[PDB]
Each structure stands twice: as C-alpha cells, then as structure tokens.
Design a protein around this nucleic acid. Sequence first.
DNA 1: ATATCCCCGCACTTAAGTGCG
DNA 2: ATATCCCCGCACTTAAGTGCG
Lengths: 354, 341, 341, 359
Amino acid sequence: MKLLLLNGHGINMHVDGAKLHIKDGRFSTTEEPQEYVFSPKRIDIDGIIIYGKSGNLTLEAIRWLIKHNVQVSILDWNGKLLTTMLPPESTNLRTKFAQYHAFEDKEARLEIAKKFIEAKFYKSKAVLDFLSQRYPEINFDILDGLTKLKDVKSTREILGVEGTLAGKYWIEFSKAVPKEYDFSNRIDQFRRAMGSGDMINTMLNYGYSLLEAECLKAINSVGLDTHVGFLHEMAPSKNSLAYDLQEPFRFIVDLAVISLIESGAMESKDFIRTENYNLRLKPTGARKIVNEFSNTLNKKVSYQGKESTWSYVIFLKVRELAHYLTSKKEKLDFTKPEYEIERIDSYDIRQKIL
Amino acid sequence: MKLLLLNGHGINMHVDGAKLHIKDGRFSTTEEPQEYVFSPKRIDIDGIIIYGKSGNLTLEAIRWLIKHNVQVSILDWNGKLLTTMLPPESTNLRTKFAQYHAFEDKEARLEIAKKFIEAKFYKSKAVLDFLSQRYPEINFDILDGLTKLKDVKSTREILGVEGTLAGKYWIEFSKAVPKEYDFSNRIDQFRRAMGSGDMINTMLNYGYSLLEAECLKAINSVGLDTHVGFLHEMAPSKNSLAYDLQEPFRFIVDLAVISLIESGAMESKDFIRTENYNLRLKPTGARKIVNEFSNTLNKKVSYQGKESTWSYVIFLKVRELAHYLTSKKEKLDFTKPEYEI
Amino acid sequence: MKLLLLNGHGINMHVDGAKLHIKDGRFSTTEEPQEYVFSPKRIDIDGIIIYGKSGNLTLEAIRWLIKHNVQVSILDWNGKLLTTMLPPESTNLRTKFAQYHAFEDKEARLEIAKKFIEAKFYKSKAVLDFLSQRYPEINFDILDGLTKLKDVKSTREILGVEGTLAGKYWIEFSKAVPKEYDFSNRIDQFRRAMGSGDMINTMLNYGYSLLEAECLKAINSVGLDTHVGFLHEMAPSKNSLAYDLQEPFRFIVDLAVISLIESGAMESKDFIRTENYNLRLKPTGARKIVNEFSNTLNKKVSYQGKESTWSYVIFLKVRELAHYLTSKKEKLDFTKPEYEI
Amino acid sequence: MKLLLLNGHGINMHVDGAKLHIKDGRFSTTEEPQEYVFSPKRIDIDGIIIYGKSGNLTLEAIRWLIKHNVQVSILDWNGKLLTTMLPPESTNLRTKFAQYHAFEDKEARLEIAKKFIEAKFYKSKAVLDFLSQRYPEINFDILDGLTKLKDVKSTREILGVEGTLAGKYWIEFSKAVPKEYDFSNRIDQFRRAMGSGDMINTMLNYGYSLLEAECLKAINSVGLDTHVGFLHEMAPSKNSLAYDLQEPFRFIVDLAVISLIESGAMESKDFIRTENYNLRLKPTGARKIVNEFSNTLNKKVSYQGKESTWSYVIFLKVRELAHYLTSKKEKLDFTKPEYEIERIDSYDIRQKILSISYV
DNA sequence: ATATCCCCGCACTTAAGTGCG
DNA sequence: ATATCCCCGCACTTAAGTGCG
Ligand SMILES: [Ca+2]
Ligand SMILES: [Ca+2]
Ligand SMILES: [Ca+2]
Ligand SMILES: [Ca+2]
Ligand SMILES: [Ca+2]
Ligand SMILES: [Ca+2]
C-alpha cells in the first residue's frame, strides 16, 4: 500500500504535458512546500488523501489520476471522509473487505480486539507511573489485568477486564486532581462518561473527541472503514474502528488534561452550564484544550529508526493494522512505540525540599 | 430534477464568499459560455455532468457541492462515466453487511439477480409496444425466454439469457430508427457494447452513463455498496451493483433517445468523428441528450399511492432492495411500477 | 376555568394557619407584587401556573392545594411544561379530552383550522398595508384566498390556499428587502424554510421560535396539549397546536424583522456560517432579534374593553379556544383583535 | 433502584450553585437529621418520598430533579399518595391516542382489562404457594376465578371476580400473620371508621403507594395516559391506568409486608395512634417499609434472556402494553415473567450457602 | 443564573440520548 | 480560520433533517 498525503493551503494538481504536477499546500509562515512530478508510465501511488484547507484540482489532473488507477480521497476538517473518486479496477477495496472478513471471524476479531486493550493497559501504567510528582499511594496493577486479558474468550470478557482496571485507574488519577474540581466519578449512574456535569470529565470528554478526530483522519488516510471495529461492536452512527484506535492513545489526552490542571490554566469562565445541567466548554476553554492536545500530540517519539510525532505514529499503527488484515504484515502490536518522561526538571524536586 | 452540463475548455467552479460560482467552458463560435451563481442552501440541481476537456475546480467547490448533496460526475471523450463524487456513505453498516451476506449465499444471490433481468425483459417489451406507430414487426416474445430465466441455475447462465434476448431486442428496435442513422445493433467485432460507431449508439452510450450516475446516487442514498452487485461478476472496484440496478431502468434511456429521433432534434452538426472511425457527441448533441434524459426521467408514474416521477421511483426501488435485504421488506419485485401508453 | 398565573422572582406559597398565602414573583425593579390569601372554605382557583425562575413552596401549601383540588403546573423558560401536580377528582383534564375529541371529528376540526388561517391572511394584509412607506407595488389580495378558504373541504386543501398567498406575501416583502441582504426565496428546494443560508430567513426562523415559545407558554397556561393541533397534523416531536397558534401572530415577527432592517442594526458579526453552510445567529445578533420581538410583542392593543399586550392577547385567544372546545363558549374568532398603526 | 425518604418537620430542598441540597426533617429524640448533597448529572436515586409534616422546596430544586429524571412523591399523613412530580410526557401522542382508541372500543377494552386481573390471580397464587411453610389452612382457588373471568361480558363484572378472589386471598393471607398484629380483612380506604387501620393493613397501604408511584413513572416514560385505565373507570383526574398496572405487581408489596412480618423487624415504636382509633406509620416504620419495598423490587427474575430486576420488569411490561396498543406488538401478557418459590430455608444454612457459592 | 435558528405530511434516516443488563 | 463535549451492547426514544408528493 502506497499513498500520498496532502495538507495545507494551495494544494495544486495540474498536468504540464503528460507529466502530472502536484504541489502540497504550505502551512508554515509562507515557505517552500513539497512538489511532485509523475510519469505516465511509473506512478506507484495507489491513492491520494487530501486533508486540505484550500486547493485547486484541474479537470485533466483528475482524469489522468483515474486513467492511472489512483484513488483521490478528500477528507473533511473533522477527519471524516468528504468524498472519494475510486478508479475502476483498484486493489484498494481489498483493505475494507479484509477488515470485514476479520470482523466476521470470531478467532480473528478477538485477537485484534485483545491487541488494542493490551496496549491501553501499558499506556495506562505509563500514565500513573509518571505520577511521581503525585506519589501519595498512586499504586497500579497492570499484570493482574494482562493475565486475565490473555485468557478472555468473548469480546465482552475483554470489556470486563478493560473496565475493572479502568475503575482502579480513575481512582489513582483522581489523587492528582485538587478537591475543588469535584471529579466525583468518571461515569454516570448508567456507567457512561457522556453528559459531563464536572470540569475534568468535560475536559476529558472534549479531549477524547479531538483524539477520535485524529483516529478518523488516520483510518480514512489508510483505506479502512471507521464504522467496523474489532473490539467495539458496529451499530448505527458508531465510528467503532475509531473507538478501538483511541484505546492505545487515550493516554495523550489524560496527560494534556493533567498538564492543564497542573498549571491551573482552567478558570470557571472557561465553562458553561446547559439547561439540562451539563457542563459544556466556553470557546476559551475549548481552545485551551485543543492547544495542549496538539502540543502533547506533536511531541516526537523514537519508533522504527525515525523520531516522529504521535499523530504520525497513529497513522503508522492504523497503516500496520491495515497491512495485517491484507497479510502484508504477519505481526500486529499497538504496545510499540512506548511512552515515558524523566522528573520534570531537577528544579521541581530541589525546590520542594524546603 | 435538474442536471448541470459542463463542456468545452476552461470550465471553472470556485467559491466566492459562500456562493458557488460555476463558469461553463468555451466551445461555441461566438455564443459565450454560460455562467452560474448559487447561494448557500439554495441549489436545485440534482447533479453536475462534466463532459469538458479543460477545467479547474476548487476544493471548497467540491466541499460546497458535497455538503449541498450535489453529485459531480466526470465522463471521458466517448461519454462513459470516468468517476463520480458522491457524499459520504451511510453510518449504518448493517445494510452493506446484509447485502454481502446475501451475495455470500449462492442461492439468495441467484434469486436477487434474476429479479433485475425479470424486470429488464418486461420493460424491453413495454417500449416496443409503445413503438406501435411503426408496426412492421413490433411483436416481442418475452415468455419463452422468461421461462428460460425462471429455470437457470447460475449467474453466468442469467448473462446467457440476458444477451440472447438483448440481440433479439435491438433486431426489432432497428425498425424505429431510419436507415440513414446506420444502426445495425449494439454488439462489437468480438462481443462488446463499448467503442461508439453508430450515431444512435453514441446517443445511447451517453444515456446509459447519465442513468448509471443516478443509480450510484440512489445506491449511496440508501446505504448499499455500489461495488457488490448480485448479477454482475464485474471487476473489484467496478460499480457492479449500479450495473445491476441499471437493467430495470434502462428502458428510460431508450425512450429518451427515441423522443429525439422522430422529434428531428438531431444533426451531424453535433457529432465529431474519431480518427479511429468512431463517433462522439459534440457539446450541442450532449446537451440535447442530458435535457431529454431529464424530461423522460421526470415523467410521473402511478406507483403505490402517489403519482411519482421515474427519478424518485429509482430511489424507492433501491430502498426496497435494501429493506428486502434487512428483512424489513419480505418480497422483492423490480416490475412492481410499470410503464404505460 | 379560573387560573392563577404566577411569574417573576421570589414566588411564595405558604400556609399561615389554616389559610393559603400566595406571594407572586416580582420581575419589576422593586415595585410591589400581588399577594393572595385564601380561606379553606372558599377557593375558586382551578389551577396555579408557575412560570417562575425563583420561588419557594412549602409542603403544607402543596398539600393544602392538592386537598382543595387546585392543580399546580410549573412551566420551564422555553414555555414548555416542566411538571404538574394534578389533584385527584379535578374537572381540569376535560379541556385536553375536548381538544383531543374535536381533532378526532372531521368537520369539527376543519372548522377550527379555518379560523387560524383566516386570521393569518388578515394580519398578512395589515403588514403589507403598513409597508406604505415602501409603496412600489406592495399590493396584496386577501378576498380571493378568503373566499377560496370558506369552501376547502380538506386540511390539505386549506394549506393549498395558505401557500399561494404566502408566496405572493414574500414577493411584497422582498419589495422591502435591500439587495445587500440576499433573499432568493422564503422556501428551499424541498419547499421548507428550515436551515437558512441567508440573513432575513435566519432572522425569521429565530424570530418565529420566539413566537413558538410564546404559544407554548400560553397553551400550557390554559391547559391544552401543545402537540394536538387542528390545522397541523400530529407527528412525533411536533408542537402542532403551537404551530397553529403561531399563524394569527406571525405578523409580530415579520414586523420585528422589518423594524430591524429599517434601523440597519444588523451588522455582519451578528451571523455565523456553519460547516453545512447554514447561517445562524451569534449571541450579539440573537439579542437584537429577542429585544425587537419583545418590544413588538409588548405593544398594547385595545381588546374586549381593556388595552392589553399582544402576549396577553395570545393567552386570551387560547383561553377562547379552550372555552370553545368545552362548549363554555359557542363563537370563536382569531381575527378579532385587529392590528393598526 | 433507590428511594429517598423524608419525614418529620423541617424538610428542605434547595440548589446551591448547581448542587442539589437535601435536609431531612426533625424527629429523632436527640439524633441529628440526614443531609444530602448532589452534584449535577451525578444523582443515583430514582424517587423522592415526602412523608414529612412540615418543610419547603424551591422551584430551582423542583426543576433540578425534573431535569435529572427524579420523581418527587408526596403522601398524606396516613400513607396514601397525595401527588407525584414526574418529568414531562412523551411527544409521541400516537401512543396516547392508540390507548384512547382501544378504550373507546368495548371488546378491545375488555380484553386488555381482563389481562391485568388475569396476571394478578397467578401472582396471588405464587405468594400463597410460597406461604406453604405456614401450611395450616392456607389453600387457594385461582382456576375457578380464572374461568369466571373468561365468561364476564362487562368491566364491572371483572371488578366483582377481582374482589371475590381478593376476599378469599386475604382470608388465606391472614393465616401467615400472627393473631397479635390483629389482621382481619382489607377494604382499601372505603368507610374510614373505628379500627379500619390494622397495624399491617396500614403497612400494605404504604407499600401500595410506593408501588403506585413506580407505575406512574413507568407509564409517564412509555408515553401512556395514567388517567385512562381499561379495568378501572374512577374519577377524571384519577390515575386509573396506574391502578390497572398496579394489579400485576401488587404481589411485590404483599411479599414485602409478609417479609417484615416474618422478620418481626416491625415494632410498636414505629406507630402513632389516631383519634378515630386508626393506625399510622412513624418515620422508623416508613423507613422499614420503603427499604423492604426497594429490596423486594431489586430482586431479579429471568425474563426474555436477561435476569432483570422487578423495577425494570414493571417498565418492560408498560412498554409491552404501549407496543401492543400501537400494534407494534401482537400479543399482550402480564402473566410472564412468573414469580418463583425457590428459597425454602430453615436449619438448612449449610446448603443454602453452598447454592450461591458454587453456581 | 445563560438559551429559543421550519412547521405542508408522509415515511423514512441520522445522531443524540436512555434504562437497563 | 471555524468548529470537535462517550463509546460496554441492546433496544429502544427523541429531535433533527430529508426526498419527495
Ligand atoms: Ca431535484
Ligand atoms: Ca438530490
Ligand atoms: Ca434505578
Ligand atoms: Ca428509573
Ligand atoms: Ca426547527
Ligand atoms: Ca458524544
């Protein structure tokens, strides 16, 4: 599988005499962005993905593309797919179908489902292990979970282990949240996180949507169906595959949230309260979260030789998952790359000793 | 139901402020290209047909059409569908999964496939009976072939009967079109319905493409998969299901083409010749077929309760297929709405 | 049917030894609100309507009320009923059943439906008349629609007449809208006004909802179901009765919309375009529409002897509907409080 | 399933900022009243039960509860339900009209009515077949009464066989209650005279008001009209449909009263006496009944796969009634789920422990 | 402690919500 | 520049939106 990913302002696609020309849109303070010239006898690209602001596609260039069996997919701002021009005869749909056979296969489904929650538990320990500055009894038990996880028979049995562990995690996380916040519990009387009335749960709920957004962008940038999950069961209006992909990356929003609390960026004027008593975010607060999420997300990580951003790593993993379905990879692992950060400067410790 | 046809060189679709600007291409001698300006939430056009050579459409334009649920189809030189840009697929994946399960089941699949061709045969005759004003041999026997369809054991066997009748159909269809139009049949030098040649064949090729487009829009609209058709054992990424659904509606194209033959609207003035000795509709010709297809598609037919347009009848027929697949409907029949005098 | 309508800040219900004390809320800038004291041996009130924000109720007062067959319904900010404490053995429900029954009877229903549309047509003239400063061809005819109405033997048939008229109304209204605004039509490609793309339509949509609220507040205040209408057919989540009651008072919104246009008060940062290309109001904008509707609604009008505000006219008119439906009144006319300037 | 009971003088419900604050009334000799604080979109309690003499509620508090789907019930000094505060009704009036349309039709109305009493009989039998440890003279009909019920051509005729069996049922039920409690017959509230308030007949009325409250919530939730019952005719503003839906679940109360009696948890300290020589429940008493009703209602029953609680089952049944009316469902039946008699315990603590601990 | 963004009907779909298990 | 306010499944409801007649 080989795709060209196009971002920024000014995505141009035209044909200067049989040679297809592609200008990736710039996002920087107006500099020189990547240019591409394709031969009508060598093009390897199986598809083009456009998560772009502005851009001009010339008619001849769309035609050339179709004639060369290049799919053109246009993503919308939210990572959700806007439209796609699929050429006749394209091994591209193999990916969506491999995914569907796998979902329909008990043995397979389970294995992939397990491969998502396995990672969640690792990243969950990493979060709470990093609570070294909030060391008052933050004790976490991951192998306990993991062992049960290796032996689970059903998909629900997974949710069981996922959940049991989750509850314990939230109790520990809460030890880092000041009393004033009123982080009562992560879930309502119906065991749902939805419709938050407290700040932290509102922060986390908005945080997670931004993560889901990336998962949507990543998935669609890879040729899979967002609606068919392995751990999460498909149902109308449920972006199930995204909900799966979120599980190995939730740690990023949990960190961002904690980072905001840590500083105290959160003010009361950042929130609003619905006629239904829910606590929504005022734009000021909505920004404070996008900005930190983007920062935590644009941190780089050492993986597969290169040092790359977390956002690229989500794409990398879903690309991996996709290949695994095709059999263009015989090993799947959302546990790698791992996460960690040493003591928040020698200052925080040396100053505290007073 | 309106379509917007774009042809010539230098076609443009840009967004100014929030309004969709559409500039038609250059093609006429001194008669200037048509200009269009569409306000947000105020667009009547069902689709867009791009038959033009040069053009430059903006990303925001594609977004503006998609959000306004306006299909953007692109053809090529001959008049066949190259690609279509349709709005995002349904969030209910049970529909697609039902469709697949039915295709998976060898027998279920065989039952659905026959239901398309069953209808195609009924409408093939219906037209030949309307063509009563040109009586020399308009008598069509479906019954003996329709009985052969009732008893076929494979999808390949269905394509065997499909063709047998298809040949006998155009053998009796010729009688309607004058000798001067040089139409023998639709078959190639080997076995194909692709490569232009005959003046009405070029008119038909374009017609079937306009119909294909509505078929995809309707397929999409319900939540089915354009690529997994029951009858057609076509290419992986080929619109097999649209090719399937084409069959019970194909008669609409045939009639629209006829509604120009005795109407004297056609002339050599709108048909450029290929260097390979084939035929291509010029913008002037293409416009006459896009408009005729549009009138013939907007003809009202008394269906269940309401006297509905043939356009809307496609939408309801594919929805029925989708409802049948999900057992929300327990009987499937593409013959149910029939054509009249 | 005698109700106690409470509203404002600091509503109070307490029992000062055997007697019920009701201290109405004060919305006014420290101006004496009404106080009520009832003996247990005499209370004519059938129900209390609390359209309050703040206030206090004691257990003794709630208990006293229930033990004296006095209903207590609390309305939420949007006009919708929040909860009602209905005493057993209370006539009160007779209203809803009369309304439910009148909708059920064919001719009975069409008789009420007609009266709603009759009044609309009249006020529709009253606006276009008032638009005398913008005299160029603002001519509108009611008498053809009024007489066609007299004999429409169907609910659908009523709508047909309402339609033709509204279409000509928005042509004359467009004769008062500056070019700078954009006002293609008042309806979309599916003949609906929902999801506006332009300014005026957005203002109208938002305006009409403020009227919808007003109708709900009144409807619930008089003890009728907001979902069962005579002209508007009940369908899930449709406030059909409010949609009916909106028609004789929509003129107030159209007035607020003209008033706003005249001032030029509407700046660009009052509107916001969505991802689906709809035009919605910013808080800044919404207030301007809210305040204008508020002033136009609070305009006093001499009715049945005492000059009363339009909001109170709405209440009085549903009061009339309730009484008509329950034989407590034989004649009904929504035209009655006519508009003038 | 949780019920917040408030008693005595000086009950208080107010909203500080966004939090609901509850203060219970004064009654305990020296022991301070209970205080509750609820965070927005974080309240687990299903209903409030005000049984307190004095106290006050703010509109913001009333609103807060409505918006958190918390039912607020008020009872008279003798346990009967004065009023309940439910969230607003369904916007699908199709279900209410489907109900009205059934009510209008005689053959239709009768069929529905009969089905309520039909179930009640089967549950009356279960209760009694459970009161089989107290075998002395307990013996019940049901089948003869079920046959009379089939024959009846009027709604009034049903109400006859309802009571004719109820009479026999209560004479039988009396064999489970000790002579000291002084339980004779029932007779609802009808003719409120001397001693028409037996110490346990009293407890039954309370339970029945809590059950009434539940049915009213379930009705409200499935968009039916509480004021249009098939079996019962009653006053215009009477919760006729609640009284109907009460019938197939009345057993839950009977069972709770019986449990409290067999426990002997009930003590003279939980009752004040009336000037017309009647009996009323004190706060301790009310608390006891509310808790044992909650316990009884939270007991599970296997129903269509899932092992669902009775509180849910009531809800499931009203929805089935609602789907039946709108023709969204073909068969109506309150007989299913059936109540089981699988808890026969004595000095058999050795195996009663090994039943749940093994499976 | 602030909101309200159609109103022809039919017969749907979609995306929020929901009351449990 | 402008958004993003869960994510156990089931089996619902509600509110919004839609493709016609
Ligand atoms: Ca159209
Ligand atoms: Ca369309
Ligand atoms: Ca509960
Ligand atoms: Ca409940
Ligand atoms: Ca609306
Ligand atoms: Ca959500």
